[PDB]
Ligand binder design. Structure first.
Ligand code: MG
Ligand code: MG
Lengths: 1202, 156
RNA sequence: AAUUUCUACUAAGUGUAGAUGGAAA
């Protein structure tokens, strides 16, 4: 019994299929005559309009009753907050008063003229009538419940839970804490009070109320609570126009006049919150883009405010301008210092001078703790960057000139794009076929977006010390406007990358709100939908509500024209259906529940909680048994055969028993001619369930979904597969028209595009239109199933795989690694270390009838990336490539699944959050995470279609070897048969012995190089092998606390590849350098001669040769021919490993090339994890660590071979 | 309805990636919280198909069991008994007060074969089901807000 | 270049081989 005979029927699932539906006979013209499409087209479209009307009435309700509330605890909150801190649980009384104030406005709303009829049924009926909108709100006269996704959230607008969208939290804890802040900051505007400007005009043209000090004194908060009051308040801040050309001044401008003496240093009055994009057509999207980025747009004025802010930046202090820690701080290091790694070096030294000892060597755990302590910090001060900086580095100039360079770059791309915001602009071609216009828009949007990404790190997540609030107050006041460009970026991008066709659909209801919920016989006259089989052309039946019983009075016809017809008896949810029925006032008046039975259910001792009594709940079990026997519908329609009363240790066990059994679909027949005459009468509607496998030409294997759906009505349906309910139906529209499809004509030799087909050209007898499926409409149908509804082998999979792998004795392992020369690379390793099968996954085999036609994806990728290159790298090319990768990581999964079945393994997989991608790899991080998703999705229910359905591994008894996916971090360190493993030191490693370089040999100085060249043990030269054998211990080098052997006798032969494309050899290069500098280098230990020279270029051309002795990976990066991995240390047999030495075999015992080596090492790390799986008890198997360290891994990979 | 779909999910996904370090309390309670949060995001996604008799679905004692094991405070639910949320027992009840309403208009008596009174009780039981489930859902959001503003994380 | 849908196809001629869990903001 191998390692997959356990893992089936382990837990539930719920897929859902999606077949098409063609109407048969006169059903389509019957629908058009009875007009059953216009109603639901309206019932899709008018919903946002009726939402608009109800939002109109709701906002009128708020602005109605807010003119009738004067808060009484407001003074007692304001003064007690602005009382000057010193709480000792007085802030707790402040919060009590705050929630009581929210309760006061909540009580005002509750008693606010009814309000109980604000989310019930009559709101669509009665109040909202009192134009032509009466039919609009009257269009839903028999259909109310679709508003319940609105009547809940607009109720939660009126809560007191301090939620975001609600009224109460806003008007008490954002408006009031802005109002009292402006009340205090009113103390710092009294020194500029000129009545000719602040009083002679504002009070006369705004309110004619009491003057400007009334809005800062706190007793018109009850007047400003309405949105009219917020309008008047933001008028006194900003300045009203009163439809005249005065442009009357505001308090922002009066406080802006104060810095005429070049010192503002007084915060302005922040405006108050009030109380409550394209994607269709080319002219519209161009106009809204003009609206949002012309030379007087709000975003553009925000850039102007930001550039003048960073022009006058030097007046603010350098003690508060916090730069955000994290990703962007590398580019900030690159632009403040010169390299990607200097801030981290200064912080490194600043930390190690405190926590490092008086030695200098490190451990890897101390390095990981060092990295954790560096990621502990939230942000950095600009003053600390001046502290990091040496002389002649003033950040207040450097960042200023950087940002003015960026702003002038945006101005230069405005000078590029100035032909676009002009009034007489023309569209000569649509944006699908035009390039220059859309690439211009792309450059604009990406330039402003890059500017936002550069500005972004000046937040420091707030909640800090005295930060420069006088700077942040306008900084966020421009940044909120600069963040609006994402609403244009995620409008223009998903406008241009959308298909020409369109997948909009509306739910079809057929005049009824209660539509196809279930398939129950004796509820089918209510649900009004049934399913008929005949041969194999399946059918969906819709009965009209005027004639909702056209299937009951049908005879078992004997003139041999029949449709078989379902019955579908399903007891739904038997743990909470049985007490719903057997205590519900009519069963209590038909089948008397015992006096002690009613009491035992009413007290409820059948549940757990220690009130659980076996021979007490067993009488309840017998009562359920006998009553289900006495029930007329459920005595007959199922075959209930339970256990005995002592054979249920839990009523949960009995519920599982009745849930297991209570489902049966059979087929009682019907006529054919009377059914088709009936659908000719129009009392039925009949659709055929159809896809591209129910046709009578399909001479191959079906779609995995049609295999399931054909298996829903088998007598093998014993594997607990169950057609559930919740089915829907849908309807599309003709996105395309028929004429303008580019159509390949008939009887012409049509082209090909897969180059590895021997039939290099073919021809057909008919047409094959481009995208025929969107020419007409089609009825999409969904029919959701629930695989493995009753689970049996239930356990924790993450422990069961481990307790399986320990007791196993030769457990196979797959590895999967990305790469540069190939997309992925599979390596299958035995329980020892022998490579069973190593191959690429660039070529995809399609093993149909007998004919293994392969197809490449790597050539497809590069041939599309050349179009990306030649087409200025625009969005259509980007998303085409992303979808091609998505199709590729679809078609990988069949190979991985079949490989898992063929070798009985556990997949290893490159962990990501410990990873350092390389950029060039073709499958990047986003596509790899999608591969993770579309691998654990499929290994939730592994099935191969060619197998027999009844046998294990089939469509009834699939493998479940994972869990469901949860969250993008919770996918870590184990998932069933997928293991996650850190990808450190997996590509540049000698597979024979395990030598890895750890030597930082990028040249710095002769001051370092002399000690570095003296630290070696014996640089000599062997003449009987012509090799420059080096020798060293590792313990005399920094960053070297991981290796285990540390006795590495290096060598030289095998040429390597430099970059400078720079092809060199090695031992001849060493000899020519040493004959450039004139050495008798045949009497070893030549370090004594090498520590005499004093010119720079000798050591600079020696470091660059040490590094080429150490460089194991060689990419010629223009061809796929020489990607050779060579290792300058040899094993016990005196031969060091070469890749091309191992490429030309059939099945090697070592990796072929670089990507395969990257797979093989990951497989080795999982093998180490299995080795530690073999060395614990079964009581720690859930705790055995898998995160194998660098030290442990190098030790295992060296001492595996010996 | 694709751009905002990806945007609102990758924002929240970034927050679930980001908040795995803020807690810095005894344990990996982030796992239980994100598991609860996605459970919330299924529940509030399609609460409506819980009303159907046999939809693809499948409480409070189970959540409290999986929450006590990690050591959080519990949820303080609104009810534990759960057995009165009406779904498709439309053959298995009678006591409702709005028969006074239904007799104020014509309607018919308490026999549901009339095609007019059927939807007139279906509406009320649908709204009562949704009104029960959001009272459930508010309890989970209250638990997340309490655990949010006690430990300074982000969940809503 | 035919597709419930997505990717690569033309694969023996109205399709082929893998995949796909839907509604909802
Ligand atoms: Mg097929
Ligand atoms: Mg295509």
């Amino acid at each position: 019994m191998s390692k997959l005979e356990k893992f089936t029927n382990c837990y539930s699932l719920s897929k859902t299929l999606r077949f098409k539906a063609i109407p048969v006979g006169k059903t389509q013209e019957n629908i058009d005559n009875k007009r059953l499409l216009v109603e639901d087209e309206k019932r899709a479209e008018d919903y946002k309009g009726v939402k608009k009307l109800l939002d109109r009435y709701y906002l009128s309700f708020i602005n109605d009753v807010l003119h009738s509330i004067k808060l009484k605890n407001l003074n007692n909150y304001i003064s007690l907050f602005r009382k000057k801190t010193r709480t000792e649980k007085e802030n707790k009384e402040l919060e009590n008063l705050e929630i009581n104030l929210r309760k006061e406005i909540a009580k005002a709303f509750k008693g606010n003229e009814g309000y109980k009829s604000l989310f019930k049924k009559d709101i669509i009926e009665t109040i909202l009538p009192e134009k032509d909108e009466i039919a609009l709100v009257n269009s839903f006269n028999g259909f109310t419940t679709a508003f319940t996704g609105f009547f809940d959230n607009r109720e939660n607008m009126f809560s007191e839970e301090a939620k975001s969208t609600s009224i109460a939290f806003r008007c008490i804890n954002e408006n009031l804490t802005r109002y009292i802040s402006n009340m205090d900051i009113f103390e710092k505007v009294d020194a500029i009070f000129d009545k000719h400007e602040v009083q002679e005009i504002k009070e006369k043209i705004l309110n004619s109320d009491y003057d400007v000090e009334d809005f800062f004194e706190g007793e018109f908060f009850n007047f400003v609570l309405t949105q009219e009051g917020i309008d008047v308040y933001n008028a006194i801040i900003g300045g009203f126009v009163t439809e005249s050309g005065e442009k009357i001044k505001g308090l922002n401008e009066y406080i802006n006049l104060y810095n005429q003496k070049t010192k503002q240093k007084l915060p302005k009055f922040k405006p108050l919150y009030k109380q409550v994009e394209g994607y269709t057509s080319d002219e519209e999207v161009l106009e809204v883009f003009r609206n949002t980025l012309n030379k007087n747009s709000e975003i553009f004025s925000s850039i102007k405010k930001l550039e003048k802010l960073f022009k006058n930046f030097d007046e603010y202090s350098s003690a508060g301008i916090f730069v955000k820690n994290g990703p962007a701080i590398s580019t900030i290091s690159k632009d403040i210092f010169g390299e990607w790694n200097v801030i981290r070096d200064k912080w490194n030294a600043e930390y190690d001078d405190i926590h490092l000892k008086k030695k200098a060597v490190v451990t890897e755990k101390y390095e990981d703790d060092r990295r954790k302590s560096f990621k502990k910090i939230g942000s950095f001060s600009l003053e600390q960057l001046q502290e990091y900086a040496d002389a002649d580095l003033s950040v207040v100039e450097k960042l200023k000139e950087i940002i003015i360079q960026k702003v002038d770059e945006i101005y230069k791309v405005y000078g590029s794009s100035e032909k676009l915001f002009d009034a007489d602009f023309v569209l000569e071609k649509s944006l699908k076929k035009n390039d220059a216009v859309v690439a211009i828009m792309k450059d604009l949007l990406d330039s402003v977006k890059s500017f936002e990404n550069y500005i972004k790190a000046f937040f420091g997540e707030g909640k800090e010390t005295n930060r420069d609030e006088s700077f942040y107050g306008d900084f966020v006041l421009a940044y909120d406007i600069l963040l609006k460009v994402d609403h244009i970026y995620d409008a223009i991008r998903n406008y241009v990358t959308q298909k020409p066709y369109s997948k909009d659909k509306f739910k079809l209801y057929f005049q009824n709100p209660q539509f196809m919920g279930g398939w129950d016989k004796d509820k089918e006259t209510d649900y009004r939908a049934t399913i008929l089989r005949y041969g194999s052309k399946y059918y969906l039946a819709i009965m009209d509500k005027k004639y909702a019983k056209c299937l009951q009075k049908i005879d078992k016809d004997d003139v041999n024209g029949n449709y078989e017809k379902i019955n579908y008896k399903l007891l739904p949810g038997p743990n909470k259906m049985l007490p719903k029925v057997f205590f519900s006032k009519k069963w209590m008046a038909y089948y008397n529940p015992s006096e002690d039975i009613q009491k035992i259910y009413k007290n409820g001792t059948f549940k757990k909680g220690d009130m659980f009594n076996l021979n007490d709940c067993h009488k309840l079990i017998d009562f359920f048994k006998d009553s289900i026997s006495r029930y007329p519908k459920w005595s007959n329609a199922y075959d209930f055969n339970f256990s005995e009363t002592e054979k249920y240790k839990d009523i949960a066990g009995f519920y599982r028993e009745v849930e297991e059994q209570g489902y049966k679909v059979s087929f009682e027949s019907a006529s054919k001619k009377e059914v088709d005459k009936l659908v000719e009468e129009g009392k039925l509607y009949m659709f055929q369930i159809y896809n591209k496998d129910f046709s009578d030409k399909s001479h191959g294997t079906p779609n995995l979904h049609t295999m399931y759906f054909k298996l829903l009505f088998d007598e093998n349906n014993h594997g607990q597969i169950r057609l559930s309910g919740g089915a829907e139906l849908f309807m599309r529209r003709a996105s395309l028209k028929k004429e303008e499809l580019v159509v390949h004509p008939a009887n012409s030799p049509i082209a090909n595009k897969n180059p590895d087909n021997p039939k290099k050209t073919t021809t057909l007898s008919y047409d094959v239109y481009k995208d025929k499926r969107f020419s007409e409409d089609q009825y999409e149908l969904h029919i959701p199933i629930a695989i493995n509804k009753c689970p049996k082998n239930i356990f924790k999979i993450n422990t069961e795989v481990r307790v399986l792998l320990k007791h196993d004795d030769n457990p196979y392992v797959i590895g999967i690694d990305r790469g540069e020369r190939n997309l992925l690379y599979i390596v299958v390793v035995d329980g020892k270390g022998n490579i069973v099968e190593q191959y690429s996954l660039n070529e995809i085999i399609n093993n149909f009838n007998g004919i293994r036609i392969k197809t490449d994806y790597h050539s497809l990728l590069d041939k599309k990336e050349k179009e990306r290159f030649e087409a200025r790298q625009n969005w259509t090319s980007i998303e085409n490539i992303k979808e091609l990768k998505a199709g590729y990581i679809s078609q990988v999964v069949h190979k991985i699944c079949e490989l898992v079945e063929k070798y009985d393994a556990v997949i290893a997989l490159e962990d990501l959050n410990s990873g350092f991608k390389n950029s060039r790899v073709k499958v990047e991080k986003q596509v790899y995470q999608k591969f993770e998703k579309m691998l654990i999705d499929k290994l939730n229910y592994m099935v191969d279609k060619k197998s027999n359905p009844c046998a294990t591994g089939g469509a009834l008894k699939g493998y479940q070897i994972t869990n469901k996916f949860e969250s993008f971090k919770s996918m870590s360190t184990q998932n069933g048969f997928i293991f996650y493993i850190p990808a450190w030191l997996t590509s540049k490693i000698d597979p024979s012995t395990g030598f890895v370089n750890l030597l930082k040999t990028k040249y710095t100085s002769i001051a370092d190089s002399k000690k570095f060249i003296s630290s070696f043990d014996r640089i000599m030269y062997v003449p009987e092998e012509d090799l420059f054998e080096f020798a060293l211990d590792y313990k005399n080098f920094s960053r070297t606390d991981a290796d285990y052997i540390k006795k590495w006798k290096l060598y030289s032969y095998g040429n390597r590849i430099r970059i400078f494309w720079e092809e060199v050899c090695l031992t001849s290069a060493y000899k020519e350098l040493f004959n450039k500098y004139g050495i008798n280098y045949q009497q070893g230990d030549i370090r004594a001669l090498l520590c005499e020279q004093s010119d720079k270029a000798f050591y600079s051309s020696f470091m660059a040769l040490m590094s080429l002795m150490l460089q194991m990976r060689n990419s010629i990066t223009g061809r796929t021919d020489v990607d050779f991995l060579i290792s300058p240390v040899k094993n016990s047999d005196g031969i060091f490993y070469d890749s091309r030495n191992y490429e030309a075999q059939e099945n090697a015992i070592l990796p072929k090339n670089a990507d395969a080596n990257g797979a093989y090492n990951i497989a080795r790390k999982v093998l180490w994890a299995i080795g530690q799986f073999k060395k614990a008890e079964d009581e720690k198997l859930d705790k055995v660590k898998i995160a194998i360290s660098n030290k442990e891994w190098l030790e295992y990979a060296q001492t595996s071979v010996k | 309805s694709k751009a905002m779909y990806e945007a609102k999910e990758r924002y929240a996904k970034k927050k679930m990636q980001e908040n795995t370090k803020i807690d810095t309390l005894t344990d990996e309670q982030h796992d239980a919280l994100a598991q609860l949060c996605a459970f919330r995001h299924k529940f509030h996604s399609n609460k409506d198909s819980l009303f159907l008799s046999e939809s693809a679905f499948s409480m409070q004692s189970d959540e409290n069991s999986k929450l006590r094991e990690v050591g959080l405070p519990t949820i303080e639910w609104s009810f534990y008994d759960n057995s009165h949320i009406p779904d498709d027992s439309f053959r298995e009840w009678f006591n409702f007060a709005n028969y006074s309403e239904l007799s104020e208009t014509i309607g018919l008596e308490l026999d549901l074969d009339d095609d007019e009174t059927y939807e007139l009780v279906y509406d009320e039981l649908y709204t009562e089901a949704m009104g029960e489930y959001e009272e459930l859902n508010q309890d989970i959001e209250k638990y997340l807000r309490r655990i949010d503003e006690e430990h300074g994380t982000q969940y809503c």
